[PDB]
Enzyme design. Structure first.
Site, PDB file in Angstrom:
ATOM      1  N   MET A 131    -119.991  15.488 -15.519  1.00 41.49           N
ATOM      2  CA  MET A 131    -121.069  15.770 -14.579  1.00 41.49           C
ATOM      3  C   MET A 131    -121.463  17.244 -14.610  1.00 41.49           C
ATOM      4  O   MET A 131    -122.656  17.566 -14.579  1.00 41.49           O
ATOM      5  CB  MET A 131    -120.702  15.314 -13.170  1.00 41.49           C
ATOM      6  N   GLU A 132    -120.496  18.162 -14.702  1.00 34.63           N
ATOM      7  CA  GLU A 132    -120.897  19.564 -14.768  1.00 34.63           C
ATOM      8  C   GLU A 132    -121.596  19.873 -16.082  1.00 34.63           C
ATOM      9  O   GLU A 132    -122.511  20.701 -16.122  1.00 34.63           O
ATOM     10  CB  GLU A 132    -119.712  20.506 -14.571  1.00 34.63           C
ATOM     11  N   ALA A 133    -121.202  19.212 -17.166  1.00 34.35           N
ATOM     12  CA  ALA A 133    -121.900  19.432 -18.422  1.00 34.35           C
ATOM     13  C   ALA A 133    -123.328  18.921 -18.354  1.00 34.35           C
ATOM     14  O   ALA A 133    -124.239  19.543 -18.906  1.00 34.35           O
ATOM     15  CB  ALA A 133    -121.148  18.766 -19.566  1.00 34.35           C
TER      16      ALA A 133
END
Lengths: 107, 49, 49, 404, 36, 49, 163, 49
Positions: D192-194
């Protein structure tokens, strides 16, 4: 989810009755004894007439209103165009669908 | 039915006293047949009147 | 949560509510002194209570 | 706190004896700490308001009182908020000057970093401007605490003093704090952060990335991506409409990437708050006169706006009232239909975006899994060498523009 | 009168109760409303 | 807080439920008129009194 | 110094202590047991152990068995024992036992298809406290309860309907 | 049934304490009586006393 569960239970009737008969006597069971009891009575390999009737009675009549052709503005409600003026985005949807389906024969 | 009566304490209603068994549905069970029978019995008075 | 530790109060025992026969016996004795008709079918009266 | 007593009539006694000794040893300076806990405004309230009030009354007749003065003695008090104390105390003639003590500024931290290590062993390879610009926002007690912590970590390391590298770690763990996270829940964070990083980097109206981390902190139970603050909007409030559309995409990118990588039946409850955030953006677009409905487009909000002051001087909170007298009962349906079109078309758009750039997404998540925290230049380099050509063209077209 | 509520599991989510005791309460409540 | 129960504004104005006001109003009106008329008809024949 | 309730490990250690002097069978799993009592503080475990012990010594034996520790957990987790269900009519026990066996059978069939459902542990129709029946499950590691994916919630719904 | 098959223990302990004091069963320091309101547990108490 209800149809899925009722389809599970109306295949293992023998196993459920074996379990009820066992639990009525001792009023207590451990998951391993339960597992082996259920194992002793595997499900039917094929379906005869009675099995088909039980599976067919494992359906529901729950009405789902916005289904298929009812996915657009009236949404299957009959009294809706006598209570509410037609919104603007509904009119845009109808316009684009009308012109698209009038391009259907010409495409 | 244990005792049917009319005008208890002079009020303008009847009173039927029902004996029931606490060990057929142990204070917890309600089946469909029972509920439909209750509905019929509760409309019978008005219908007979 | 204090008086429950082992040794202080280690055993709880449950007294249920009486049944038809229990109520029958209960009402038979509380009436020995009162004036009561002898032909009282105490069991039947306890069935509706 | 020494004047807080539940007996009958000793608070005024303590005030009186304090002021009599001060008058006897004049000239003087009388400092009273914890003033915010006794000198709040008098009211009916509970029964403490029978005596706690009385106490304050004594005070109100010592600093001004009768006798016209004692000497001119200076009295000072430590309080956190001037608005909590009643008007009788803080009025001029009883407290003439009101001075403020804020957190250390850039210069304040610049000199407090060195002044706190004059009596502390430390090496020569230190640049105090780096730590002065590196820990902005902490209190002075917290600077003392981070110095204490660096010294103690040196103790636990065997050395007596600390270089830069470890007191930097001490301050960063004083900010974000120091839990075990499984290996299956860790790839969700990574993915998700990527995806958020890839979106914020490929959309031209969003600020560049600052750093991305997957290590949960004490308060946020998942990872964080941080954008570089654009001072323009933050000082003026000129948040255009293009920016709000892109911010909708960026709010939904997390769920888009989660479902793209981990299959649809693995959608988690880690995007509950990003869904609430996307709802916020989509309803603000309508309430700000930016809809495409002709009856709403450049004319109206949703209803009637009322403001109310928050817990600060210049803060206000907005409120909209919508009734039958401003919305017509088929504009309600239109508002819902339009907001939902925004939300779901935005999901589809960001999803097809992340699809076209799968290689960059997986490279970023592998890198994040192997390093646990990365900086914006690494993300930029990866995206630049791996992204789709059309997205890189669209990104480079709007490269130099100051505000979009 | 010295002073049940479903507003606690709807909005605050407490749910400080085993499912079995809640199910028993539901059974007895329905039977008591309908047959007493 | 808007009203959500619109049902009809084509030959009348109706909201969800209210399927019993026409009946009740007809009853009230007719009964009051009939009572007034019987009073009038009685007094019409007793004017000298 | 602020310290709240112990974790699974905090709990395992306590019941290792209180059960060090006594003896237990090889099958009785103290890890799974200490994992299935989240929320107790120290002495409640001691009550559990001593009640299991008095149950076992009344049982004419000395070695604690699974049934005995299970009885102790139940005298505190659920409540005191109560008179059994009447057997004069078929209805009561048939209904409650069908509830229990339906939950258990559906859980077993789901777990053998997707793998997310727990294992069923104990099934009983003995009135105890305020309930009349119980289907108990084996709780998992807390890592499994930080999330709630889609399929896991579908399974929760199906297990709620099955009974 | 079960409550009596258990309270035979307190009967024996109140009969002769030295026999089961050190026999292996811990001292019966307290018993709890649970039931419905007005169940009349005190009666049963008297019986053991």
């Amino acid at each position: 989810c209800s149809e899925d569960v009722l389809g599970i239970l109306a295949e293992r009737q023998e196993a459920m009755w074996a379990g009820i008969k066992a639990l009525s006597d001792r009023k207590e069971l451990l998951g391993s004894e339960l597992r082996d009891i259920f194992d002793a009575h595997p499900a039917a390999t094929s379906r005869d007439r009675d099995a088909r009737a039980e599976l067919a009675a494992a359906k529901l009549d729950m009405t789902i209103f916005t289904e298929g052709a009812n996915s657009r503005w009236p949404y299957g409600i009959e009294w809706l165009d006598d209570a509410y003026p037609k919104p603007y985005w509904v009119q845009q949807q109808e316009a684009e669908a009308a012109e698209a389906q009038a391009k259907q024969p010409a495409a | 039915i244990a005792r049917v009566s009319v005008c208890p304490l002079n009020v303008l209603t009847g009173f039927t006293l029902f004996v029931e068994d606490e060990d057929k549905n142990v204070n917890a069970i309600l089946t469909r047949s029972e509920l439909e029978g209750r509905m019929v019995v509760h409309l019978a008075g008005r219908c007979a009147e | 949560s204090a008086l429950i530790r082992p040794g202080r109060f280690d055993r709880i025992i449950y007294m249920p509510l009486p049944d038809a026969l229990g109520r029958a016996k209960i009402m038979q004795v509380h009436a020995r002194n009162k004036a009561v008709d002898p032909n009282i079918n105490w069991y039947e009266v306890a069935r509706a209570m | 706190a020494e004047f807080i007593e539940m007996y009958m009539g000793l608070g005024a006694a303590r005030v009186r004896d304090l002021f009599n000794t001060a008058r006897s040893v004049a000239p003087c300076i009388i400092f009273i700490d914890e003033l915010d806990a006794v000198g709040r405004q008098r009211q009916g309230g509970g029964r403490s308001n029978d005596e706690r009030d009385n106490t304050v009354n004594q005070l109100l007749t010592e600093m001004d009182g009768f006798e016209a003065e004692q000497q001119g003695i200076v009295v000072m008090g430590a309080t956190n908020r001037k608005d909590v104390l009643d008007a009788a105390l803080t009025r001029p003639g009883r407290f003439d000057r009101s001075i403020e003590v804020r957190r250390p500024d850039f210069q304040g931290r610049l000199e407090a970093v060195k002044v706190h290590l004059r009596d502390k062993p430390v090496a020569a390879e230190i640049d105090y401007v780096s730590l002065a610009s590196l820990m902005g926002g902490m209190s002075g007690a917290q600077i003392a605490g981070v110095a204490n912590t660096a010294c103690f970590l040196a103790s636990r390391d065997g050395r007596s003093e600390v270089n830069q590298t470890d007191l930097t770690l001490a301050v960063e763990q004083a900010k974000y704090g120091r839990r075990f996270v499984g290996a299956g829940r860790k790839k969700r964070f990574a993915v998700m952060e990527a995806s958020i990083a890839l979106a914020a980097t490929l959309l031209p109206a969003i600020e560049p990335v600052e750093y991305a981390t997957i290590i949960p902190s004490t308060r946020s139970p998942l990872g964080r991506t941080v954008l570089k603050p654009h001072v323009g909007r933050y000082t003026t409030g000129v948040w255009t409409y293009r920016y709000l559309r892109e911010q909708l995409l960026v709010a939904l990118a997390g769920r888009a990437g989660e479902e793209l990588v981990l299959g649809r039946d693995e959608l988690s409850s880690l995007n509950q708050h990003r869904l609430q955030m996307a709802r916020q953006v989509a309803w603000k677009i309508m309430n700000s006169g930016m809809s495409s409905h002709p009856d709403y487009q450049h004319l109206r909000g949703l209803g009637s706006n009322y403001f109310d002051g928050s817990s600060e001087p210049g803060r206000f909170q907005q409120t909209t009232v919508v009734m039958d007298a401003n919305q017509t009962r088929s504009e309600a349906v239109d508002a819902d239909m339009e907001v939902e079109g925004l939300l779901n078309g935005g999901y589809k758009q960001v999803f097809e975006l992340l699809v076209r750039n799968r290689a960059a997404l997986d490279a970023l998540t592998e890198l994040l899994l192997e390093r646990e925290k990365i900086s914006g230049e690494e993300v930029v380099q990866v995206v630049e060498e791996l992204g789709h050509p059309e997205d890189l063209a669209r990104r480079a077209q709007w490269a130099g523009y100051e505000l979009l | 009168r010295r002073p049940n509520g479903s507003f606690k599991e709807d909005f605050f989510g407490s749910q400080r109760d085993e499912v079995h005791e809640k199910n028993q309460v539901v059974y007895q409540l329905t039977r008591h409303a309908i047959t007493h | 807080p808007k009203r959500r129960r619109w049902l009809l504004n084509n030959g009348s104005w109706n909201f969800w439920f209210n399927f019993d006001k026409l009946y009740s109003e007809e009853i009230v009106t007719t009964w009051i008129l009939e009572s007034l008329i019987q009073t009038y008809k009685y007094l019409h024949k007793n004017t000298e009194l | 110094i602020r310290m709240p309730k112990p974790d699974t490990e905090g709990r395992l250690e306590i019941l290792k202590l209180h059960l060090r002097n006594k003896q237990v069978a090889p099958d009785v799993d103290l890890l799974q047991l200490a994992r299935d009592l989240p929320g107790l503080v120290g002495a409640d475990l001691a009550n559990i152990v001593n009640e299991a012990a008095m149950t076992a010594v009344r049982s004419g034996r000395q070695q604690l068995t699974a049934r005995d520790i299970y009885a102790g957990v139940d005298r505190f987790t659920q409540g005191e024992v109560r008179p059994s269900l009447p057997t004069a009519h078929k209805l009561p026990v048939l209904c409650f036992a069908a509830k229990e066996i339906g939950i258990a059978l559906v859980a077993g069939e789901l777990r053998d298809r997707y793998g997310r459902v727990e294992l069923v542990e104990r099934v009983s129709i003995q009135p105890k406290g305020r309930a009349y029946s119980r289907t108990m499950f084996q709780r998992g590691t807390d890592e499994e309860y930080q999330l709630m994916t889609r399929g896991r919630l579908l399974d929760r719904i199906r297990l709620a309907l099955a009974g | 049934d079960e409550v009596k098959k258990e309270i035979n223990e307190i009967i024996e302990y109140l009969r002769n304490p030295a026999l089961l004091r050190s026999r292996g069963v811990a001292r019966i320091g307290g018993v709890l009586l649970a039931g419905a309101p007005g169940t009349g547990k005190t009666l049963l108490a008297k019986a053991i006393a």
